[PDB]
Amino acid sequence: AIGEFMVSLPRMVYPQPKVLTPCRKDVLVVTPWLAPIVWEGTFNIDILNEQFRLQNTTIGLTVFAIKKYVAFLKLFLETAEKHFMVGHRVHYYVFTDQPAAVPRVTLGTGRQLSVLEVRRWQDVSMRRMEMISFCERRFLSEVDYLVCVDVDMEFRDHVGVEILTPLFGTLHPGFYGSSREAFTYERRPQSQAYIPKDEGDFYYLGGFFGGSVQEVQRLTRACHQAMMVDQANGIEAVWHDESHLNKYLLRHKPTKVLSPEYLWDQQLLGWPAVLRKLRFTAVP
């Protein structure tokens, strides 16, 4: 559940937060609209696990595995079992054109997997946003939060309830140090995804976003509608649904932002000092 009567935390023994000692001095840990930016060292996972377990939180994880991308599911799911929301209730939703190619992955207790079969490049571009906004009633009934990720990835370290919030995006690992003018937003005013050179907070990834079911459905519905307008006007945004996600999150600020720990490519970008953990990474 979300927002329900919250029982008292038990007694806990942990290090005292010190007001005149930052957790991290090397990075921005809060946005200018007072959303936490989630980095290692900023959260006590024991406190957060208590809070979310006391709400009996259920997390849905959506992933699309189409055509040859079904080959990525085994490592994706095996590593999710090791690292993603361990101890919490998890429902995986695997959207695929090949239900029989989904690997039989052994799940921990309190975790389940559903295989959802799905059916022009234009409809392929819009499929993720459309499908998340077909699954509307199901997600509302089954999970509290939705996390929407790409399949050609593996978990390497903890990804847990520290990410959960009404609406989150993830800082793209290519652009977290860039000035806004260099962001690869859609720049043509004819597109619904258009962002001028003097606007923008961050460049968020299409491959890792989420929130409450309600907020995720609002985002995916808005992006799908904007993509349909663009299609009608004969324009395709430079980075497809990621361009629309960026426009949405500019105008509807996320309530947490995940640091690039949460989606990194070690082959392309190495392992910078500022990343204490690489939690979820591109498969080479």
Side-chain angles (χ1 to χ4, degrees), residues 205-239:
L205 280 148
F208 198 154
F209 63 91
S212 68
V213 176
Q214 179 170 46
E215 291 301 309
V216 172
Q217 288 170 346
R218 283 166 171 167
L219 179 154
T220 59
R221 182 184 309 120
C223 290
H224 180 214
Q225 289 186 195
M227 288 175 83
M228 289 188 298
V229 173
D230 273 10
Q231 187 165 335
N233 296 154
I235 187 164
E236 174 66 17
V238 62
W239 290 110

PDB file of all heavy atoms in Angstrom, residues 205-239:
ATOM      1  N   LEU A 205      17.225   9.210 -18.626  1.00  0.00           N
ATOM      2  CA  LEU A 205      17.234   8.019 -19.478  1.00  0.00           C
ATOM      3  C   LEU A 205      15.869   7.479 -19.769  1.00  0.00           C
ATOM      4  O   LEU A 205      15.023   7.367 -18.879  1.00  0.00           O
ATOM      5  CB  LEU A 205      17.888   6.881 -18.732  1.00  0.00           C
ATOM      6  CG  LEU A 205      19.364   6.931 -18.755  1.00  0.00           C
ATOM      7  CD1 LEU A 205      19.866   6.335 -17.455  1.00  0.00           C
ATOM      8  CD2 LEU A 205      19.895   6.180 -19.959  1.00  0.00           C
ATOM      9  N   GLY A 206      15.652   7.046 -21.002  1.00  0.00           N
ATOM     10  CA  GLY A 206      14.433   6.308 -21.288  1.00  0.00           C
ATOM     11  C   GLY A 206      14.411   4.929 -20.646  1.00  0.00           C
ATOM     12  O   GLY A 206      13.324   4.379 -20.430  1.00  0.00           O
ATOM     13  N   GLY A 207      15.585   4.379 -20.341  1.00  0.00           N
ATOM     14  CA  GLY A 207      15.773   3.008 -19.842  1.00  0.00           C
ATOM     15  C   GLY A 207      15.650   2.720 -18.363  1.00  0.00           C
ATOM     16  O   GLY A 207      15.889   1.596 -17.939  1.00  0.00           O
ATOM     17  N   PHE A 208      15.295   3.721 -17.563  1.00  0.00           N
ATOM     18  CA  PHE A 208      15.103   3.482 -16.116  1.00  0.00           C
ATOM     19  C   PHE A 208      14.303   4.641 -15.549  1.00  0.00           C
ATOM     20  O   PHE A 208      14.849   5.704 -15.259  1.00  0.00           O
ATOM     21  CB  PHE A 208      16.452   3.343 -15.392  1.00  0.00           C
ATOM     22  CG  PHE A 208      16.399   2.700 -14.034  1.00  0.00           C
ATOM     23  CD1 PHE A 208      17.525   2.059 -13.563  1.00  0.00           C
ATOM     24  CD2 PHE A 208      15.284   2.690 -13.216  1.00  0.00           C
ATOM     25  CE1 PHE A 208      17.541   1.458 -12.321  1.00  0.00           C
ATOM     26  CE2 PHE A 208      15.299   2.086 -11.970  1.00  0.00           C
ATOM     27  CZ  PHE A 208      16.440   1.460 -11.517  1.00  0.00           C
ATOM     28  N   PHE A 209      12.997   4.457 -15.418  1.00  0.00           N
ATOM     29  CA  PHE A 209      12.136   5.435 -14.782  1.00  0.00           C
ATOM     30  C   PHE A 209      11.053   4.687 -14.016  1.00  0.00           C
ATOM     31  O   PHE A 209      10.933   3.454 -14.151  1.00  0.00           O
ATOM     32  CB  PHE A 209      11.508   6.420 -15.799  1.00  0.00           C
ATOM     33  CG  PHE A 209      10.596   5.763 -16.796  1.00  0.00           C
ATOM     34  CD1 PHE A 209       9.239   5.648 -16.533  1.00  0.00           C
ATOM     35  CD2 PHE A 209      11.070   5.294 -17.997  1.00  0.00           C
ATOM     36  CE1 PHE A 209       8.378   5.026 -17.426  1.00  0.00           C
ATOM     37  CE2 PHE A 209      10.202   4.679 -18.899  1.00  0.00           C
ATOM     38  CZ  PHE A 209       8.869   4.541 -18.603  1.00  0.00           C
ATOM     39  N   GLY A 210      10.296   5.386 -13.190  1.00  0.00           N
ATOM     40  CA  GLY A 210       9.276   4.697 -12.414  1.00  0.00           C
ATOM     41  C   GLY A 210       8.607   5.605 -11.436  1.00  0.00           C
ATOM     42  O   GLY A 210       8.731   6.831 -11.519  1.00  0.00           O
ATOM     43  N   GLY A 211       7.870   5.012 -10.507  1.00  0.00           N
ATOM     44  CA  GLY A 211       7.093   5.784  -9.559  1.00  0.00           C
ATOM     45  C   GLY A 211       5.904   5.005  -9.077  1.00  0.00           C
ATOM     46  O   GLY A 211       5.863   3.791  -9.236  1.00  0.00           O
ATOM     47  N   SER A 212       4.941   5.696  -8.490  1.00  0.00           N
ATOM     48  CA  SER A 212       3.662   5.048  -8.164  1.00  0.00           C
ATOM     49  C   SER A 212       2.979   4.654  -9.446  1.00  0.00           C
ATOM     50  O   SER A 212       3.244   5.210 -10.504  1.00  0.00           O
ATOM     51  CB  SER A 212       2.777   5.975  -7.353  1.00  0.00           C
ATOM     52  OG  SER A 212       2.373   7.066  -8.163  1.00  0.00           O
ATOM     53  N   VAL A 213       2.068   3.688  -9.370  1.00  0.00           N
ATOM     54  CA  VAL A 213       1.376   3.276 -10.582  1.00  0.00           C
ATOM     55  C   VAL A 213       0.666   4.469 -11.227  1.00  0.00           C
ATOM     56  O   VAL A 213       0.759   4.639 -12.422  1.00  0.00           O
ATOM     57  CB  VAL A 213       0.346   2.159 -10.347  1.00  0.00           C
ATOM     58  CG1 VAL A 213      -0.415   1.849 -11.631  1.00  0.00           C
ATOM     59  CG2 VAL A 213       1.036   0.902  -9.859  1.00  0.00           C
ATOM     60  N   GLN A 214      -0.004   5.275 -10.417  1.00  0.00           N
ATOM     61  CA  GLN A 214      -0.724   6.431 -10.930  1.00  0.00           C
ATOM     62  C   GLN A 214       0.197   7.379 -11.688  1.00  0.00           C
ATOM     63  O   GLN A 214      -0.131   7.834 -12.790  1.00  0.00           O
ATOM     64  CB  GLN A 214      -1.398   7.164  -9.793  1.00  0.00           C
ATOM     65  CG  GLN A 214      -2.156   8.407 -10.218  1.00  0.00           C
ATOM     66  CD  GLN A 214      -3.007   8.979  -9.101  1.00  0.00           C
ATOM     67  OE1 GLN A 214      -2.548   9.121  -7.969  1.00  0.00           O
ATOM     68  NE2 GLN A 214      -4.246   9.323  -9.416  1.00  0.00           N
ATOM     69  N   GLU A 215       1.350   7.699 -11.103  1.00  0.00           N
ATOM     70  CA  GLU A 215       2.246   8.662 -11.759  1.00  0.00           C
ATOM     71  C   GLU A 215       2.918   8.100 -12.988  1.00  0.00           C
ATOM     72  O   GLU A 215       3.140   8.813 -13.976  1.00  0.00           O
ATOM     73  CB  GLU A 215       3.306   9.186 -10.822  1.00  0.00           C
ATOM     74  CG  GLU A 215       2.769  10.083  -9.733  1.00  0.00           C
ATOM     75  CD  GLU A 215       2.043  11.298 -10.274  1.00  0.00           C
ATOM     76  OE1 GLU A 215       2.597  12.002 -11.121  1.00  0.00           O
ATOM     77  OE2 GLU A 215       0.921  11.548  -9.823  1.00  0.00           O
ATOM     78  N   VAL A 216       3.253   6.826 -12.946  1.00  0.00           N
ATOM     79  CA  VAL A 216       3.834   6.195 -14.114  1.00  0.00           C
ATOM     80  C   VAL A 216       2.811   6.130 -15.262  1.00  0.00           C
ATOM     81  O   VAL A 216       3.161   6.370 -16.433  1.00  0.00           O
ATOM     82  CB  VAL A 216       4.414   4.795 -13.775  1.00  0.00           C
ATOM     83  CG1 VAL A 216       4.846   4.064 -15.039  1.00  0.00           C
ATOM     84  CG2 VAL A 216       5.615   4.948 -12.849  1.00  0.00           C
ATOM     85  N   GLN A 217       1.560   5.841 -14.949  1.00  0.00           N
ATOM     86  CA  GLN A 217       0.534   5.846 -16.002  1.00  0.00           C
ATOM     87  C   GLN A 217       0.289   7.235 -16.555  1.00  0.00           C
ATOM     88  O   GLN A 217       0.094   7.370 -17.762  1.00  0.00           O
ATOM     89  CB  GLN A 217      -0.726   5.173 -15.523  1.00  0.00           C
ATOM     90  CG  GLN A 217      -0.465   3.679 -15.431  1.00  0.00           C
ATOM     91  CD  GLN A 217      -1.544   2.871 -14.749  1.00  0.00           C
ATOM     92  OE1 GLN A 217      -2.435   3.401 -14.086  1.00  0.00           O
ATOM     93  NE2 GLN A 217      -1.421   1.553 -14.861  1.00  0.00           N
ATOM     94  N   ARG A 218       0.375   8.265 -15.711  1.00  0.00           N
ATOM     95  CA  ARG A 218       0.276   9.645 -16.198  1.00  0.00           C
ATOM     96  C   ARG A 218       1.413   9.980 -17.160  1.00  0.00           C
ATOM     97  O   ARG A 218       1.200  10.565 -18.231  1.00  0.00           O
ATOM     98  CB  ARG A 218       0.271  10.646 -15.043  1.00  0.00           C
ATOM     99  CG  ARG A 218      -1.060  10.720 -14.340  1.00  0.00           C
ATOM    100  CD  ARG A 218      -0.981  11.449 -13.014  1.00  0.00           C
ATOM    101  NE  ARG A 218      -2.338  11.673 -12.475  1.00  0.00           N
ATOM    102  CZ  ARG A 218      -2.608  12.062 -11.235  1.00  0.00           C
ATOM    103  NH1 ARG A 218      -1.642  12.255 -10.348  1.00  0.00           N
ATOM    104  NH2 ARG A 218      -3.873  12.289 -10.878  1.00  0.00           N
ATOM    105  N   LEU A 219       2.632   9.600 -16.793  1.00  0.00           N
ATOM    106  CA  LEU A 219       3.777   9.851 -17.646  1.00  0.00           C
ATOM    107  C   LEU A 219       3.661   9.130 -18.971  1.00  0.00           C
ATOM    108  O   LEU A 219       3.871   9.735 -20.035  1.00  0.00           O
ATOM    109  CB  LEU A 219       5.079   9.455 -16.935  1.00  0.00           C
ATOM    110  CG  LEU A 219       6.418   9.624 -17.674  1.00  0.00           C
ATOM    111  CD1 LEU A 219       7.522   9.793 -16.635  1.00  0.00           C
ATOM    112  CD2 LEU A 219       6.739   8.477 -18.620  1.00  0.00           C
ATOM    113  N   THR A 220       3.373   7.828 -18.913  1.00  0.00           N
ATOM    114  CA  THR A 220       3.356   7.015 -20.127  1.00  0.00           C
ATOM    115  C   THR A 220       2.186   7.426 -21.034  1.00  0.00           C
ATOM    116  O   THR A 220       2.361   7.485 -22.260  1.00  0.00           O
ATOM    117  CB  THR A 220       3.381   5.509 -19.817  1.00  0.00           C
ATOM    118  OG1 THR A 220       2.242   5.155 -19.006  1.00  0.00           O
ATOM    119  CG2 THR A 220       4.696   5.141 -19.099  1.00  0.00           C
ATOM    120  N   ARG A 221       1.039   7.771 -20.449  1.00  0.00           N
ATOM    121  CA  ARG A 221      -0.096   8.281 -21.230  1.00  0.00           C
ATOM    122  C   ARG A 221       0.269   9.573 -21.923  1.00  0.00           C
ATOM    123  O   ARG A 221       0.011   9.721 -23.123  1.00  0.00           O
ATOM    124  CB  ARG A 221      -1.306   8.483 -20.335  1.00  0.00           C
ATOM    125  CG  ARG A 221      -2.598   8.963 -20.990  1.00  0.00           C
ATOM    126  CD  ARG A 221      -3.663   9.194 -19.899  1.00  0.00           C
ATOM    127  NE  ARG A 221      -3.790   8.020 -19.016  1.00  0.00           N
ATOM    128  CZ  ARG A 221      -3.589   7.960 -17.691  1.00  0.00           C
ATOM    129  NH1 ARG A 221      -3.287   9.026 -16.950  1.00  0.00           N
ATOM    130  NH2 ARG A 221      -3.740   6.790 -17.077  1.00  0.00           N
ATOM    131  N   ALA A 222       0.860  10.513 -21.202  1.00  0.00           N
ATOM    132  CA  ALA A 222       1.247  11.815 -21.796  1.00  0.00           C
ATOM    133  C   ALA A 222       2.260  11.616 -22.905  1.00  0.00           C
ATOM    134  O   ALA A 222       2.135  12.219 -23.976  1.00  0.00           O
ATOM    135  CB  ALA A 222       1.804  12.767 -20.743  1.00  0.00           C
ATOM    136  N   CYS A 223       3.255  10.762 -22.683  1.00  0.00           N
ATOM    137  CA  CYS A 223       4.274  10.533 -23.723  1.00  0.00           C
ATOM    138  C   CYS A 223       3.651   9.868 -24.961  1.00  0.00           C
ATOM    139  O   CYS A 223       4.004  10.197 -26.097  1.00  0.00           O
ATOM    140  CB  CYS A 223       5.443   9.682 -23.190  1.00  0.00           C
ATOM    141  SG  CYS A 223       6.500  10.554 -21.993  1.00  0.00           S
ATOM    142  N   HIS A 224       2.766   8.902 -24.746  1.00  0.00           N
ATOM    143  CA  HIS A 224       2.119   8.218 -25.852  1.00  0.00           C
ATOM    144  C   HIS A 224       1.300   9.222 -26.656  1.00  0.00           C
ATOM    145  O   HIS A 224       1.390   9.225 -27.894  1.00  0.00           O
ATOM    146  CB  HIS A 224       1.253   7.084 -25.344  1.00  0.00           C
ATOM    147  CG  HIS A 224       0.548   6.331 -26.425  1.00  0.00           C
ATOM    148  ND1 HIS A 224      -0.704   5.786 -26.253  1.00  0.00           N
ATOM    149  CD2 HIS A 224       0.927   6.025 -27.682  1.00  0.00           C
ATOM    150  CE1 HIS A 224      -1.077   5.195 -27.376  1.00  0.00           C
ATOM    151  NE2 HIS A 224      -0.106   5.319 -28.255  1.00  0.00           N
ATOM    152  N   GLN A 225       0.528  10.067 -25.984  1.00  0.00           N
ATOM    153  CA  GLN A 225      -0.280  11.076 -26.701  1.00  0.00           C
ATOM    154  C   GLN A 225       0.605  12.043 -27.488  1.00  0.00           C
ATOM    155  O   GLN A 225       0.317  12.332 -28.653  1.00  0.00           O
ATOM    156  CB  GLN A 225      -1.172  11.849 -25.726  1.00  0.00           C
ATOM    157  CG  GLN A 225      -2.317  10.998 -25.182  1.00  0.00           C
ATOM    158  CD  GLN A 225      -3.347  11.727 -24.298  1.00  0.00           C
ATOM    159  OE1 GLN A 225      -4.129  11.076 -23.607  1.00  0.00           O
ATOM    160  NE2 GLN A 225      -3.385  13.060 -24.340  1.00  0.00           N
ATOM    161  N   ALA A 226       1.716  12.496 -26.903  1.00  0.00           N
ATOM    162  CA  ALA A 226       2.635  13.406 -27.569  1.00  0.00           C
ATOM    163  C   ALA A 226       3.288  12.751 -28.782  1.00  0.00           C
ATOM    164  O   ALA A 226       3.484  13.400 -29.825  1.00  0.00           O
ATOM    165  CB  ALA A 226       3.701  13.896 -26.596  1.00  0.00           C
ATOM    166  N   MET A 227       3.621  11.471 -28.659  1.00  0.00           N
ATOM    167  CA  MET A 227       4.208  10.726 -29.765  1.00  0.00           C
ATOM    168  C   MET A 227       3.220  10.572 -30.907  1.00  0.00           C
ATOM    169  O   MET A 227       3.619  10.654 -32.079  1.00  0.00           O
ATOM    170  CB  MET A 227       4.717   9.364 -29.293  1.00  0.00           C
ATOM    171  CG  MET A 227       5.965   9.513 -28.451  1.00  0.00           C
ATOM    172  SD  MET A 227       6.565   7.971 -27.731  1.00  0.00           S
ATOM    173  CE  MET A 227       7.481   7.332 -29.111  1.00  0.00           C
ATOM    174  N   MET A 228       1.951  10.359 -30.584  1.00  0.00           N
ATOM    175  CA  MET A 228       0.906  10.294 -31.617  1.00  0.00           C
ATOM    176  C   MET A 228       0.721  11.603 -32.353  1.00  0.00           C
ATOM    177  O   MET A 228       0.566  11.594 -33.592  1.00  0.00           O
ATOM    178  CB  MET A 228      -0.408   9.810 -31.019  1.00  0.00           C
ATOM    179  CG  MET A 228      -0.337   8.336 -30.670  1.00  0.00           C
ATOM    180  SD  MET A 228      -1.900   7.618 -30.179  1.00  0.00           S
ATOM    181  CE  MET A 228      -2.263   8.563 -28.721  1.00  0.00           C
ATOM    182  N   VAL A 229       0.773  12.721 -31.632  1.00  0.00           N
ATOM    183  CA  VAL A 229       0.738  14.049 -32.258  1.00  0.00           C
ATOM    184  C   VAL A 229       1.911  14.226 -33.209  1.00  0.00           C
ATOM    185  O   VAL A 229       1.715  14.624 -34.364  1.00  0.00           O
ATOM    186  CB  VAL A 229       0.687  15.183 -31.222  1.00  0.00           C
ATOM    187  CG1 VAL A 229       0.831  16.550 -31.888  1.00  0.00           C
ATOM    188  CG2 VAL A 229      -0.636  15.110 -30.479  1.00  0.00           C
ATOM    189  N   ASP A 230       3.116  13.896 -32.757  1.00  0.00           N
ATOM    190  CA  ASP A 230       4.289  13.972 -33.620  1.00  0.00           C
ATOM    191  C   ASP A 230       4.138  13.110 -34.890  1.00  0.00           C
ATOM    192  O   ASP A 230       4.464  13.563 -35.999  1.00  0.00           O
ATOM    193  CB  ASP A 230       5.553  13.578 -32.844  1.00  0.00           C
ATOM    194  CG  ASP A 230       6.195  14.746 -32.112  1.00  0.00           C
ATOM    195  OD1 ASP A 230       5.615  15.846 -32.021  1.00  0.00           O
ATOM    196  OD2 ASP A 230       7.333  14.566 -31.648  1.00  0.00           O
ATOM    197  N   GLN A 231       3.625  11.894 -34.729  1.00  0.00           N
ATOM    198  CA  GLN A 231       3.425  10.995 -35.879  1.00  0.00           C
ATOM    199  C   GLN A 231       2.469  11.626 -36.885  1.00  0.00           C
ATOM    200  O   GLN A 231       2.758  11.650 -38.094  1.00  0.00           O
ATOM    201  CB  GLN A 231       2.889   9.662 -35.394  1.00  0.00           C
ATOM    202  CG  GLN A 231       2.811   8.605 -36.469  1.00  0.00           C
ATOM    203  CD  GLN A 231       2.621   7.222 -35.893  1.00  0.00           C
ATOM    204  OE1 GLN A 231       2.996   6.952 -34.746  1.00  0.00           O
ATOM    205  NE2 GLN A 231       2.068   6.323 -36.697  1.00  0.00           N
ATOM    206  N   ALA A 232       1.367  12.183 -36.386  1.00  0.00           N
ATOM    207  CA  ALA A 232       0.379  12.876 -37.243  1.00  0.00           C
ATOM    208  C   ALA A 232       0.993  14.049 -37.988  1.00  0.00           C
ATOM    209  O   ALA A 232       0.635  14.284 -39.145  1.00  0.00           O
ATOM    210  CB  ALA A 232      -0.831  13.330 -36.440  1.00  0.00           C
ATOM    211  N   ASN A 233       1.925  14.755 -37.342  1.00  0.00           N
ATOM    212  CA  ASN A 233       2.666  15.890 -37.912  1.00  0.00           C
ATOM    213  C   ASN A 233       3.936  15.500 -38.695  1.00  0.00           C
ATOM    214  O   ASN A 233       4.708  16.380 -39.084  1.00  0.00           O
ATOM    215  CB  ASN A 233       3.024  16.904 -36.805  1.00  0.00           C
ATOM    216  CG  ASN A 233       1.800  17.559 -36.151  1.00  0.00           C
ATOM    217  OD1 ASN A 233       1.872  17.995 -34.991  1.00  0.00           O
ATOM    218  ND2 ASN A 233       0.693  17.662 -36.874  1.00  0.00           N
ATOM    219  N   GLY A 234       4.162  14.203 -38.918  1.00  0.00           N
ATOM    220  CA  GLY A 234       5.306  13.715 -39.677  1.00  0.00           C
ATOM    221  C   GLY A 234       6.679  14.033 -39.116  1.00  0.00           C
ATOM    222  O   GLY A 234       7.613  14.314 -39.870  1.00  0.00           O
ATOM    223  N   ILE A 235       6.816  13.975 -37.791  1.00  0.00           N
ATOM    224  CA  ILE A 235       8.100  14.249 -37.148  1.00  0.00           C
ATOM    225  C   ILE A 235       8.330  13.158 -36.101  1.00  0.00           C
ATOM    226  O   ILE A 235       7.379  12.695 -35.475  1.00  0.00           O
ATOM    227  CB  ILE A 235       8.189  15.689 -36.585  1.00  0.00           C
ATOM    228  CG1 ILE A 235       9.613  15.989 -36.064  1.00  0.00           C
ATOM    229  CG2 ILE A 235       7.134  15.934 -35.520  1.00  0.00           C
ATOM    230  CD1 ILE A 235       9.889  17.460 -35.858  1.00  0.00           C
ATOM    231  N   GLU A 236       9.571  12.697 -35.995  1.00  0.00           N
ATOM    232  CA  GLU A 236       9.965  11.676 -35.023  1.00  0.00           C
ATOM    233  C   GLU A 236      11.078  12.272 -34.179  1.00  0.00           C
ATOM    234  O   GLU A 236      12.116  12.686 -34.705  1.00  0.00           O
ATOM    235  CB  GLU A 236      10.473  10.411 -35.728  1.00  0.00           C
ATOM    236  CG  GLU A 236      11.040   9.327 -34.810  1.00  0.00           C
ATOM    237  CD  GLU A 236      10.008   8.702 -33.890  1.00  0.00           C
ATOM    238  OE1 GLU A 236       8.795   8.856 -34.153  1.00  0.00           O
ATOM    239  OE2 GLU A 236      10.404   8.012 -32.909  1.00  0.00           O
ATOM    240  N   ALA A 237      10.866  12.342 -32.857  1.00  0.00           N
ATOM    241  CA  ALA A 237      11.848  12.977 -31.992  1.00  0.00           C
ATOM    242  C   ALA A 237      13.198  12.272 -32.070  1.00  0.00           C
ATOM    243  O   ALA A 237      13.256  11.036 -32.229  1.00  0.00           O
ATOM    244  CB  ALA A 237      11.367  13.008 -30.551  1.00  0.00           C
ATOM    245  N   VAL A 238      14.258  13.055 -31.907  1.00  0.00           N
ATOM    246  CA  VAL A 238      15.638  12.594 -32.074  1.00  0.00           C
ATOM    247  C   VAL A 238      15.968  11.313 -31.303  1.00  0.00           C
ATOM    248  O   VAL A 238      16.671  10.436 -31.817  1.00  0.00           O
ATOM    249  CB  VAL A 238      16.643  13.722 -31.740  1.00  0.00           C
ATOM    250  CG1 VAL A 238      16.524  14.191 -30.287  1.00  0.00           C
ATOM    251  CG2 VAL A 238      18.079  13.304 -32.051  1.00  0.00           C
ATOM    252  N   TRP A 239      15.471  11.195 -30.073  1.00  0.00           N
ATOM    253  CA  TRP A 239      15.677   9.989 -29.269  1.00  0.00           C
ATOM    254  C   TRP A 239      14.354   9.351 -28.828  1.00  0.00           C
ATOM    255  O   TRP A 239      14.252   8.712 -27.774  1.00  0.00           O
ATOM    256  CB  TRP A 239      16.633  10.286 -28.102  1.00  0.00           C
ATOM    257  CG  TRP A 239      18.038  10.520 -28.594  1.00  0.00           C
ATOM    258  CD1 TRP A 239      18.721  11.686 -28.603  1.00  0.00           C
ATOM    259  CD2 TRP A 239      18.901   9.547 -29.200  1.00  0.00           C
ATOM    260  NE1 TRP A 239      19.964  11.513 -29.170  1.00  0.00           N
ATOM    261  CE2 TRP A 239      20.103  10.203 -29.528  1.00  0.00           C
ATOM    262  CE3 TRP A 239      18.782   8.186 -29.473  1.00  0.00           C
ATOM    263  CZ2 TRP A 239      21.185   9.541 -30.136  1.00  0.00           C
ATOM    264  CZ3 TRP A 239      19.870   7.521 -30.067  1.00  0.00           C
ATOM    265  CH2 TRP A 239      21.049   8.205 -30.382  1.00  0.00           C
TER     266      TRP A 239
END
